[PDB]
C-alpha cells in the first residue's frame, strides 16, 4: 500500500498542481537557508521560478493544467545532499561545543 498510498497522498497534498517540487515546500529554518545558499545557480534559479509561479497561481486561486503538474515519479530531492551536509556540519560544531 505505502507506495500506492504515497502517490495518492502526493496528489492529495497538491503542491504538484502548482508545479512545485516537494523540496520547494520545505519550511525554511537556518539549516535549510544555508543549504539553499549552497545550491548551484541553475538549481537555485529553478527553485525561485517554481515558487514564483506557484505564488502567482495561489494568488489567482488557480492551478496548472493537469499535464504540467509535477509527477510523483519524477519529483526528486535536489536539496537533500546540501541540507544533509549542512546538518552534519552543525552537529559536528555542537559536539565540540560540549568541549
Amino acid at each position: 500500500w505505502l507506495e500506492g498510498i504515497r502517490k495518492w497522498y502526493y496528489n492529495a497534498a497538491g503542491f504538484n498542481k502548482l508545479g512545485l517540487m516537494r523540496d520547494d515546500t520545505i519550511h525554511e529554518n537556518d539549516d535549510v537557508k544555508e543549504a539553499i545558499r549552497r545550491l548551484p545557480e541553475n538549481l537555485y534559479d529553478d527553485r525561485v521560478f517554481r515558487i514564483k509561479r506557484a505564488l502567482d497561481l495561489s494568488m489567482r486561486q488557480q492551478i496548472l493544467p493537469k499535464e504540467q503538474w509535477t509527477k510523483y515519479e519524477e519529483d526528486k530531492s535536489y536539496l537533500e545532499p546540501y541540507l544533509k551536509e549542512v546538518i552534519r556540519e552543525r552537529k559536528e560544531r555542537e559536539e565540540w561545543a560540549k568541549k
Binding site: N42, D45, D46, F49, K52, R53, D56, M59, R60
Partner: protein
C-alpha cells in the same frame, strides 16, 4: 423597552441601500487595481 425601534429600522433601510451601492463600487475598485496582477504573465528564460 425599545423606543429606538422604529428609528433603527429606518436607518437599517438606509444602511442596506448605501452598502448596496458602496460594496459593488469598492469591489470594482479592488478588481480594477488587482487586474494588473491577475493578468500578469510570467516567463522563465534561464541561459542554457
Amino acid at each position: 423597552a425599545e423606543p429606538e425601534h422604529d428609528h433603527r429600522k429606518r436607518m437599517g433601510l438606509k444602511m442596506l441601500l448605501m452598502m448596496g451601492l458602496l460594496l459593488p463600487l469598492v469591489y470594482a475598485m479592488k478588481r480594477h487595481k488587482w487586474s494588473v496582477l491577475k493578468s500578469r504573465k510570467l516567463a522563465y528564460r534561464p541561459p542554457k
